Design a protein around this motif. Sequence first.
Motif, PDB file in Angstrom:
ATOM      1  N   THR A 147     -25.776   9.974  -1.886  1.00  0.00           N
ATOM      2  CA  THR A 147     -25.024  11.109  -1.355  1.00  0.00           C
ATOM      3  C   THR A 147     -23.566  10.872  -1.795  1.00  0.00           C
ATOM      4  N   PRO A 148     -22.687  11.872  -1.638  1.00  0.00           N
ATOM      5  CA  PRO A 148     -21.302  11.620  -2.064  1.00  0.00           C
ATOM      6  C   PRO A 148     -20.639  10.398  -1.416  1.00  0.00           C
ATOM      7  N   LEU A 149     -20.871  10.180  -0.127  1.00  0.00           N
ATOM      8  CA  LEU A 149     -20.235   9.037   0.531  1.00  0.00           C
ATOM      9  C   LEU A 149     -21.053   8.577   1.729  1.00  0.00           C
ATOM     10  N   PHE A 150     -21.446   7.305   1.753  1.00  0.00           N
ATOM     11  CA  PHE A 150     -22.210   6.833   2.911  1.00  0.00           C
ATOM     12  C   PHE A 150     -21.711   5.495   3.458  1.00  0.00           C
ATOM     13  N   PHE A 191     -21.930  -0.036   1.638  1.00  0.00           N
ATOM     14  CA  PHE A 191     -21.424   1.328   1.597  1.00  0.00           C
ATOM     15  C   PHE A 191     -21.564   1.792   0.150  1.00  0.00           C
ATOM     16  N   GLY A 192     -21.389   3.084  -0.076  1.00  0.00           N
ATOM     17  CA  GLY A 192     -21.523   3.579  -1.428  1.00  0.00           C
ATOM     18  C   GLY A 192     -21.330   5.074  -1.481  1.00  0.00           C
ATOM     19  N   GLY A 193     -21.688   5.654  -2.618  1.00  0.00           N
ATOM     20  CA  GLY A 193     -21.546   7.090  -2.792  1.00  0.00           C
ATOM     21  C   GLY A 193     -21.368   7.396  -4.265  1.00  0.00           C
ATOM     22  N   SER A 194     -20.848   8.577  -4.576  1.00  0.00           N
ATOM     23  CA  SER A 194     -20.620   8.916  -5.985  1.00  0.00           C
ATOM     24  C   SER A 194     -19.503   7.991  -6.476  1.00  0.00           C
ATOM     25  N   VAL A 195     -19.386   7.811  -7.784  1.00  0.00           N
ATOM     26  CA  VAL A 195     -18.337   6.928  -8.279  1.00  0.00           C
ATOM     27  C   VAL A 195     -16.961   7.409  -7.807  1.00  0.00           C
ATOM     28  N   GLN A 196     -16.731   8.714  -7.888  1.00  0.00           N
ATOM     29  CA  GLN A 196     -15.448   9.265  -7.487  1.00  0.00           C
ATOM     30  C   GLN A 196     -15.136   8.993  -6.016  1.00  0.00           C
ATOM     31  N   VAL A 198     -16.413   6.607  -4.060  1.00  0.00           N
ATOM     32  CA  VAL A 198     -16.292   5.176  -3.816  1.00  0.00           C
ATOM     33  C   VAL A 198     -14.930   4.683  -4.299  1.00  0.00           C
ATOM     34  N   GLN A 199     -14.464   5.201  -5.433  1.00  0.00           N
ATOM     35  CA  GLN A 199     -13.165   4.756  -5.920  1.00  0.00           C
ATOM     36  C   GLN A 199     -12.069   5.284  -4.998  1.00  0.00           C
ATOM     37  N   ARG A 200     -12.259   6.480  -4.452  1.00  0.00           N
ATOM     38  CA  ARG A 200     -11.259   7.000  -3.523  1.00  0.00           C
ATOM     39  C   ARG A 200     -11.150   6.091  -2.302  1.00  0.00           C
ATOM     40  N   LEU A 201     -12.294   5.680  -1.753  1.00  0.00           N
ATOM     41  CA  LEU A 201     -12.312   4.816  -0.584  1.00  0.00           C
ATOM     42  C   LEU A 201     -11.674   3.454  -0.870  1.00  0.00           C
ATOM     43  N   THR A 202     -12.064   2.812  -1.963  1.00  0.00           N
ATOM     44  CA  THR A 202     -11.514   1.487  -2.272  1.00  0.00           C
ATOM     45  C   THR A 202     -10.009   1.554  -2.582  1.00  0.00           C
ATOM     46  N   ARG A 203      -9.583   2.654  -3.190  1.00  0.00           N
ATOM     47  CA  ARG A 203      -8.172   2.856  -3.508  1.00  0.00           C
ATOM     48  C   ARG A 203      -7.389   3.055  -2.197  1.00  0.00           C
ATOM     49  N   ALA A 204      -7.964   3.792  -1.251  1.00  0.00           N
ATOM     50  CA  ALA A 204      -7.280   4.023   0.025  1.00  0.00           C
ATOM     51  C   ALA A 204      -7.185   2.729   0.821  1.00  0.00           C
ATOM     52  N   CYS A 205      -8.288   1.991   0.841  1.00  0.00           N
ATOM     53  CA  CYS A 205      -8.357   0.716   1.547  1.00  0.00           C
ATOM     54  C   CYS A 205      -7.296  -0.234   0.999  1.00  0.00           C
ATOM     55  N   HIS A 206      -7.259  -0.351  -0.324  1.00  0.00           N
ATOM     56  CA  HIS A 206      -6.330  -1.252  -1.014  1.00  0.00           C
ATOM     57  C   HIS A 206      -4.879  -0.914  -0.647  1.00  0.00           C
ATOM     58  N   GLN A 207      -4.537   0.370  -0.684  1.00  0.00           N
ATOM     59  CA  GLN A 207      -3.189   0.814  -0.338  1.00  0.00           C
ATOM     60  C   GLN A 207      -2.862   0.484   1.124  1.00  0.00           C
ATOM     61  N   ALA A 208      -3.799   0.755   2.032  1.00  0.00           N
ATOM     62  CA  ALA A 208      -3.586   0.475   3.454  1.00  0.00           C
ATOM     63  C   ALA A 208      -3.407  -1.012   3.730  1.00  0.00           C
ATOM     64  N   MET A 209      -4.171  -1.848   3.034  1.00  0.00           N
ATOM     65  CA  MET A 209      -4.065  -3.288   3.242  1.00  0.00           C
ATOM     66  C   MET A 209      -2.730  -3.829   2.729  1.00  0.00           C
ATOM     67  N   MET A 210      -2.183  -3.191   1.700  1.00  0.00           N
ATOM     68  CA  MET A 210      -0.891  -3.615   1.164  1.00  0.00           C
ATOM     69  C   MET A 210       0.238  -3.244   2.124  1.00  0.00           C
ATOM     70  N   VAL A 211       0.111  -2.089   2.769  1.00  0.00           N
ATOM     71  CA  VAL A 211       1.110  -1.643   3.730  1.00  0.00           C
ATOM     72  C   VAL A 211       1.104  -2.630   4.903  1.00  0.00           C
TER      73      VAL A 211
END
Length: 266
Positions: A147-150, A191-196, A198-211
Motif C-alpha cells: 500500500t502507499p504507506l503502512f 514499516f514500508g510503502g511505495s518508494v516515494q 517511504v523516502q518521505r517518512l525517512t526524510r522527515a524522521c531524519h530532519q526531526a532527529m537533527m532538530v
Amino acid sequence: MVSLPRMVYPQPKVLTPCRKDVLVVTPWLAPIVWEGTFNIDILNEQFRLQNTTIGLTVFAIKKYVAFLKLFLETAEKHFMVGHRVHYYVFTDQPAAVPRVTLGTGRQLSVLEVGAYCERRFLSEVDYLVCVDVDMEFRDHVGVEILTPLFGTLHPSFYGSSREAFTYERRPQSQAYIPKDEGDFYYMGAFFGGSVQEVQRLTRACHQAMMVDQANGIEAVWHDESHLNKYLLRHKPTKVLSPEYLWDQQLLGWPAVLRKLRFTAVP
Ligand SMILES: [Hg+2]
Ligand SMILES: [Hg+2]
Ligand SMILES: [Hg+2]
C-alpha cells in the motif's frame, strides 16, 4: 489496470464479518491486516498483473551479520513468494554476508556502510519494506501488506490504552505526542510503502532527529518515537496486525493471532 481473469472462490458474505474479535479497519478507512480478512489469490493476481517488485531492506552491522543467514533463508520461504523481490543488505562487513540460494526472480544487493543513492530505489522497486535483521519469517508475508504507506502494531501495545503508549512525552522533542493523542503504537522494526512514501517518512524522521539533536534531546525510543509521530500526522493506508511482528518467547501465542508470521529470534 488489466482485467483480472475468471476466478472461483467463496462469495464474500455482507452480513457476515470476517473477524468479530478484532478491529479490521481504522477510523480513516485503512484496512488492518489480520488472517481471514484477505483472499491472497485475488491479491496475488492483482499485484502480479502489475509486475510488482518489492524491495526488502535490512541493516546488519557488527554482530548482527550473524542473523542474515536465517533471515534470508526464511524470507525465501515466506516473503512475497511468486513476486519479484530485491533484497538490499546494508552492512559494514560485505565479505561476511552468507551465500544464500535465491528463487527465480529474486536478487540481492550488498551495500557497504560507514556511509554509502535513493534514486536507485525509485527505478528498481515499486515498494520498499524496511525491517530488522534479528528476526525470522515463520509464515506467509505477502502482497496483502502493500500500500502507499503502512505501519505495524507493536506486539506489546496492541491492547493498551494510548496513555500507556511509550510515545515521547516531552514537549521539547519533535516526536512529542500528548496523552490525549495517538491511534496506535507502531513498532519501528517493520514499516514500508511505495518508494516515494517511504523516502518521505525517512526524510522527515531524519530532519526531526537533527532538530532534537541540535536541541540537546534524544527521543525516548529514538527512530521509533519519530516514526510514531509521523504516522500520527500522516495516517498509514494499511496497518499490519501483530501477526507481522511477534515475540513468542516474550508474549506466547494468544488466540487472537491465527498465524505468527515474522518473529524475533532467541
Ligand atoms: Hg527502508
Ligand atoms: Hg531517523
Ligand atoms: Hg522514521
